[PDB]
Amino acid sequence: MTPHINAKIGDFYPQCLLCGDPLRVSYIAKKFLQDAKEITNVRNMLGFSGKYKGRGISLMGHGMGIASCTIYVTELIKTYQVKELLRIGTCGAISPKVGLKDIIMATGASTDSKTNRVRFLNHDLSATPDFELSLRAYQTAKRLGIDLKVGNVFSSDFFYSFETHAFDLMAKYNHLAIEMEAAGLYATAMELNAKALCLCSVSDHLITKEALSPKERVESFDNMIILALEMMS
Amino acid sequence: MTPHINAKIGDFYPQCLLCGDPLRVSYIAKKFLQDAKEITNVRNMLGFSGKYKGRGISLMGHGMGIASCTIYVTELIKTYQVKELLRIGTCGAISPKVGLKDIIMATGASTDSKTNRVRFLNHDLSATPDFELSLRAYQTAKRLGIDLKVGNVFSSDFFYSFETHAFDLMAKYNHLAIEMEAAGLYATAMELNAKALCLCSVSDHLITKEALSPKERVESFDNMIILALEMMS
Amino acid sequence: MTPHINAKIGDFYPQCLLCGDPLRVSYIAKKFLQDAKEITNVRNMLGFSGKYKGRGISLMGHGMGIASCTIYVTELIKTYQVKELLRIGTCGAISPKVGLKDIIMATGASTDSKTNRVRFLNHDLSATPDFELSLRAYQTAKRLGIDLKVGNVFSSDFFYSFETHAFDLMAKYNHLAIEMEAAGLYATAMELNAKALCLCSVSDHLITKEALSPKERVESFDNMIILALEMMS
Amino acid sequence: MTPHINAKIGDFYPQCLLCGDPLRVSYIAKKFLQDAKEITNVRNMLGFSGKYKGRGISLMGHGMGIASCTIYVTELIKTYQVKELLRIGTCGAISPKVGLKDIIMATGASTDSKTNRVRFLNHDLSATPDFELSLRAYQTAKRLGIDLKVGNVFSSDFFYSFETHAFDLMAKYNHLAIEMEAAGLYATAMELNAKALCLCSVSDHLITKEALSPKERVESFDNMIILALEMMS
Amino acid sequence: MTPHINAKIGDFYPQCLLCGDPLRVSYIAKKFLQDAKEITNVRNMLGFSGKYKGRGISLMGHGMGIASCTIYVTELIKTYQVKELLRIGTCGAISPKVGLKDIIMATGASTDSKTNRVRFLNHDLSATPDFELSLRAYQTAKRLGIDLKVGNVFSSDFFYSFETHAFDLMAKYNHLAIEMEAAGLYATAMELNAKALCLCSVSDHLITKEALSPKERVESFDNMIILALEMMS
Amino acid sequence: MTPHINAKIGDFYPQCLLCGDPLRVSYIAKKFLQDAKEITNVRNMLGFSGKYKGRGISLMGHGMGIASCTIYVTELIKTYQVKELLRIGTCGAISPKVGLKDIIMATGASTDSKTNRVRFLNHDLSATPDFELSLRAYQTAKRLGIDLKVGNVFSSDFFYSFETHAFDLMAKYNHLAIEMEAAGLYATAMELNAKALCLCSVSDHLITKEALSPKERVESFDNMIILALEMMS
Numbered sequence A, B, C, D, E, F: 001m002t003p004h005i006n007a008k009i010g011d012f013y014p015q016c017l018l019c020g021d022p023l024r025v026s027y028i029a030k031k032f033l034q035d036a037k038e039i040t041n042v043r044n045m046l047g048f049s050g051k052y053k054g055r056g057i058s059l060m061g062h063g064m065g066i067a068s069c070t071i072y073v074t075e076l077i078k079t080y081q082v083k084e085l086l087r088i089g090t091c092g093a094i095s096p097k098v099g100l101k102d103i104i105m106a107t108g109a110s111t112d113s114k115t116n117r118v119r120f121l122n123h124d125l126s127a128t129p130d131f132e133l134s135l136r137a138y139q140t141a142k143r144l145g146i147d148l149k150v151g152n153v154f155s156s157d158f159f160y161s162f163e164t165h166a167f168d169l170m171a172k173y174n175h176l177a178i179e180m181e182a183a184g185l186y187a188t189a190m191e192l193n194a195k196a197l198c199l200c201s202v203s204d205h206l207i208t209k210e211a212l213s214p215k216e217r218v219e220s221f222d223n224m225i226i227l228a229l230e231m232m233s
């Protein structure tokens, strides 16, 4: 066991879906998995293992922000032997190319965090997902007829940004939305030689000023959840 | 009313005790408060309002990491009108000046985060608590017979550090322990003109490798809890 | 029409293949294109327009280094209306996952340059290629029987590195090879909403010290050239 | 002896008051100490030892700026065995919370200097005073009926700032005034395990545009001087 | 031989003139040198050796940007034994002190590159030329009656700057013009204990909006070329 | 008229000689000037005006450190209309190219300070002297039979360095000696369009550990003083 996960070694399948919200994770387990079992619950951060269309898959909450996400992903890889990590989170749209509830695949995660400079020689680590997972997401979305939006996200240490004046510049450089964990997921999976990808659905729109309720952030994104389950089967 | 808290405006008392672990918040509510009511539970991050010696006291979990802590503290101040925020938690000791079950009061929080540079003109923000609250902590601790250890902590973006070789230098510069949120708590409270303080309990020494027993950990944390509840009376 | 290119507006096809060495551009024009016409030669940096399997294709040299590459790519997009830019070249391998005559597709370009910090709010820009172009490269490579190696490259301001001790850490974080322009190609193309990609051929392994023979180098580079010309068809 | 102090070892008492201006130091010796002796004068930087209410106390000039202050404080601690260092300087008010000639106690010293990044792993050192000295200053001011203003100061390498547009932001983050040495005093005393505190009286007001003459900067601050002498007795 | 120069050891004279444009180098060889021989041509980057007034002198192209220039200068010094390197390039005027086609001697080369921080402890390397070469240029210009403008240049990684709003500030700090290689020439020659100087003629004026054609950038600067040849004889 | 200088406007001649030590300024006034009058003494930082060979010459102390030097130099230029500023002092040699009683002329001043980044867009300012003044120094030194050693110095915020292991790298890059103000003198004078230069005398070699005798130190410094006074004639 680890300080933040109280499952047994082997309780996790090698493929794991992730959300920051452990209640979205619980929602997915109850609605979409067969024979789902809760396998961890330290700090109320739930994780589960179950089956989708006969294939074992795990689910795990990763909390909010790069530091939190790095903790759980690090332990999932090094202790629990997880090989493929698919984040399915929420994000704030800053580009006019996307609308509320669109699903974005993050081809790269820019950041205002210092974590990657600390990791990577004080240089610019371009944090990126595994290409095969990215390809699988693209192909599965096409097979399902889901309009997958593809581009960079900006992973911030701030939900309440001090730099909103810079969002248009971010969008000009192909950042479709802002969230807070992808760059940490990506850099941890690069560190540890694991396969990771980040999808996020648009829960807030900074141009149109739209925002979903907390309940809607759990329940409104079945399309992104089903996309994730299909690509992992 | 916010994406991360679903309490009604007015549910929070203006004095709030915070922990990273929402189950520790739950423990405090059930064991130490009278008439405790759960008031928020988005993302399983529990908060409560109750009374201690007739005085209204709120409790809120804030998760792991500066970014997570900054979300909750910002919303508590700006939406729920919280005025005093007392963070309690455990911390890994790195200084020979502290030992097991010591309680540290952080009069400064250094960091490897980029957040305060983003907040503060790319310069060095000295992240400090409210002085009156620190004085209140010192006077209450003396009246309870607690020998408070006072110094800096180091707030890291990394639980699994890449710089363990630097702990000794940290200790030389009067950093007694490492944790992961104090600098964000303090910078947010300075931004927003609120009173904040961080106390942390030594259950593990990262240098000597000494660790408390599980019943000593419960006992040590209860002493902290009482110190915190007494200074909010 | 620009200080560095003396072609007439309209001389460039909207799809352009790029190399750092203008003599390699010349080699490609004479060996692989039909009706090739030299269209620019300022500073001896040659560019050409010709046809491959009836399709119009342009070629342009860009010199060595992010700053040099950014000049040419900017002018090609903004003045000559180039829309797709495929960079091919050699790169020094640093990862045990690649070997001699492997072809790498860079889905991210890290850097020791300050350019992307200057472009991007002093934060970390994740410099990434156009996803559709990368997918086109992967599908074309499979149809030609090429096993494309996909990962990051590190774009350095230094040919003669002062940080050779850091190559292993670079490789750990999924940097397969080092070159000197991809991060600038990618950042310029994101700035200007153009589609860009970088492929590089392994003729030298900087770790194992293995090197191709001069006829193997020609042979390896021709395979790249054909892959590039086929994806622009 | 040291390059910058020509006193004998043992000439300094373990408690020392500091000013940047050696003529304020001389003023204090003549007006407030019994049997004051000049004990050092290299570079015209005067230092003294004498008695206040029967208790031995020393005085020393530290010149202007972090670099200058670091030199004298370093030598006072390592060669002359000084244990408690109380800076009593001047500062420029940037916050509407304070007026001309108010006395500020610096709970922390933010800075635009690079010295603490050079000292502290290129991270953010939150430079802070010794808590017991801070407490003593608070209690002595109360006993004397002095209205001690308490908060952060910003220690700058610039008296003539290039960033006056940022002063309101500084004040929002609880920086009451700007001066040029506290962060260096604090970081040197943290380095060397000594007790330090910075008090400063407001000699310039950046909101009301007030400014004292050079003579007034020596002679107008008896209240802060007497506060210092009382807390050290 | 080196990867970027295919001359024999000894083909270069110890004194070498440099331009970024290998066609300006070729122009000088044909128009001004006796018995000029082309001695290198990798990547179309021409170099020559010939005689001026009986004295052997070499010429070499260095391409565009600090990274490119660093490659050729490094190899010229370490392999080809070049002792004195005189850059005679072009630049964009940002100061009202100079006009189109003025000749500037760069007493120092500021930069937005990270290369010197990577070279020099992450501190500020003030990149400067050899004083004796500077003196020789001053004296030769006086003997020839050429009005040599003297001050700093700013060496940028950007020809198309994202910071034009800062050019007036640059000019205030005695930066007469902007170019892209001097800081790299200067830092490489400091690294390797060689003598270097940068002269540049104004080919673009950012205040008056003037700009020369590509042909004029080769042919309009005989005065700077003859100055260079005279100081090296 | 300023917080740090109490001379009357007009008391300063437009040519000023500067030293960090005000007692050295005093020494020069009494030994080398005619009709010397003390004109300022705030903080014991003495300044004088007198004549040398009938020419009016001012002297001013500037203290230790870039921040201290910048205060005095700014006030001298902006309030007292000083136009030429010649700094003389001692410096610790770090290069094998210089030895005891050599005099160095600093044609560049590197630094570990953040001041020039704050002044100059967060980029690298190459801090350089006025060229005409440097030429005047070189011509006067030759006429007096002095073999001036010309190169960079390193201006540090630290007298007691934390980076002594880096002195050799400093020396490699043509830093002949270390001192603590030249970069600030030079940056202030470039900001304000004044002519400045720094000469420093080698009385200590920080590598070889050789040191002058106290009478050799007086003798060496007098030779400097005469060189300075002669170039201001």
Ligand SMILES: Clc1nc(SCc2ccccc2)c2[nH]cnc2n1
Pocket (backbone or CB within 6 Å): A090, A091, A092, A156, A158, A159, A160, A161, A178, A179, A180, A203, A204, A206
């Ligand atoms: Cl950093 C980030 N920002 C947002 S919207 C920020 C936002 C804040 C205030 C007002 C409007 C919008 C997110 N929505 C889901 N994940 C997210 N991550």
Ligand SMILES: Clc1nc(SCc2ccccc2)c2[nH]cnc2n1
Pocket (backbone or CB within 6 Å): D090, D091, D092, D156, D158, D159, D160, D161, D178, D179, D180, D203, D204, D206
């Ligand atoms: Cl950095 C600093 N600034 C000031 S007022 C700066 C100031 C400069 C120009 C005009 C008005 C005010 C101080 N007064 C006493 N100590 C101090 N330290």
Ligand SMILES: Clc1nc(SCc2ccccc2)c2[nH]cnc2n1
Pocket (backbone or CB within 6 Å): E090, E091, E092, E156, E158, E159, E160, E161, E178, E179, E180, E203, E204, E206
């Ligand atoms: Cl960085 C640099 N910039 C310029 S003018 C830039 C410029 C760009 C766009 C429009 C007007 C001017 C140069 N001219 C010769 N060398 C040079 N180096």
